[PDB]
């Protein structure tokens, strides 16, 4: 098929200083950090993934490395560079509000059914790019989506991205390993979900083992109490045995988009509209020198 064009960007470790740690799991550690590149005066928030030294990890970085290089969308998660140091560090687009899974939890009381269909709509977009590009997630959930601001969300983690999470896979993959871009639909259904439940952990108490049979009887996730049928016969869709009879990405974007045109018809949440969460048009919406600072996605080389 077609030429992979992307630029991989080799930054200098001396252009950019880490400021905080934001996480630290079995990968290694993401800090926050701020990236001053050439004779720019420019200063990029920016995300630092950093990988001990083994031959496979610094592979599979790599592999992750190759996919977020290759992809450009609004709603989608690029890789800004990467840095050759003793351990290998991935240079990324800060999200300050961090994952979409966590944001639910800890801000259900001011998230009105705007937001949440105008995510879901966000959601459909990012993966229906990915489907233009040929490629299949293989692991959309909440905590893999990122928050840039209240009102922008971008799919993440590339780590599994082709051309396990039992509870988020669909039937064909838990039995035969079969990955397509229907089944990206069904995790995209269980993610949708999670919103829709405020952060709720699907099939909860449920051993992974269990989920395969329980799927083949016919059980699905439960309709969240905020959601219509019209929301939920959507979910349902996107967990039919038939991957074909589920809907499309560009579907998904059609019928959450004429939902997030009149949000209360479909989403029954007690106080909506009189919520709100920040935007860039609060005070002090924007530590250091806040003197020249740009946000990744306006600045282009
Ligand atoms: C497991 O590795 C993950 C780490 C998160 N990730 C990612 N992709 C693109 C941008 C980005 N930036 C990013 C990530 C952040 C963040 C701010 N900005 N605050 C927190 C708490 N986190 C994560 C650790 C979830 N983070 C995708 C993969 F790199």
Not at 27 to 37: A, N, R, S
Not at 127 to 135: I, K, T
Request: proline share 6%.
């Amino acid at each position: 098929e077609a030429p992979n064009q992307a630029l991989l960007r080799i930054l200098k470790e001396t252009e950019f200083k880490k400021i905080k740690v934001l996480g630290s799991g079995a990968f290694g550690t993401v800090y926050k950090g701020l990236w001053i590149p050439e004779g720019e005066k420019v200063k990029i928030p920016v995300a630092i993934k950093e990988l001990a030294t083994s031959p496979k990890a610094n592979k599979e970085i790599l592999d992750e490395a190759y996919v977020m290089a290759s992809v450009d969308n609004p709603h989608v998660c690029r890789l800004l560079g990467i840095c050759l140091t003793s351990t290998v560090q991935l240079i990324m687009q800060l999200m300050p509000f961090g994952c979409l899974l966590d944001y639910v939890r800890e801000h259900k009381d001011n998230i009105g059914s705007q937001y949440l269909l105008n995510w879901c709509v966000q959601i459909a977009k990012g993966m229906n790019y990915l489907e233009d590009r040929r490629l299949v997630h293989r692991d959309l959930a909440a905590r893999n989506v990122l928050v840039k601001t209240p009102q922008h969300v971008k799919i993440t983690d590339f780590g599994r991205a082709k051309l396990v999470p039992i509870k988020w896979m669909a039937l064909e993959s838990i039995l035969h390993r079969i990955y397509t871009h229907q089944s990206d639909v069904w995790s995209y259904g269980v993610t949708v979900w999670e919103l829709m439940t405020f952060g709720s952990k699907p099939y909860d108490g449920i051993p992974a083992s269990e989920i395969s049979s329980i799927l083949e009887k016919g059980e699905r996730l439960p309709q969240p109490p905020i959601c219509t049928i019209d929301v939920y016969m959507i979910m349902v869709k996107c967990w039919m045995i038939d991957a074909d009879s589920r809907p499309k990405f560009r579907e998904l974007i059609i019928e959450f988009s004429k939902m997030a045109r009149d949000p209360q018809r479909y989403l029954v949440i007690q106080g909506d509209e009189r919520m709100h969460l920040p935007s860039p048009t609060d005070s002090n919406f924007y530590e250091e020198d806040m003197d020249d600072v740009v946000d990744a996605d306006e600045y282009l080389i």
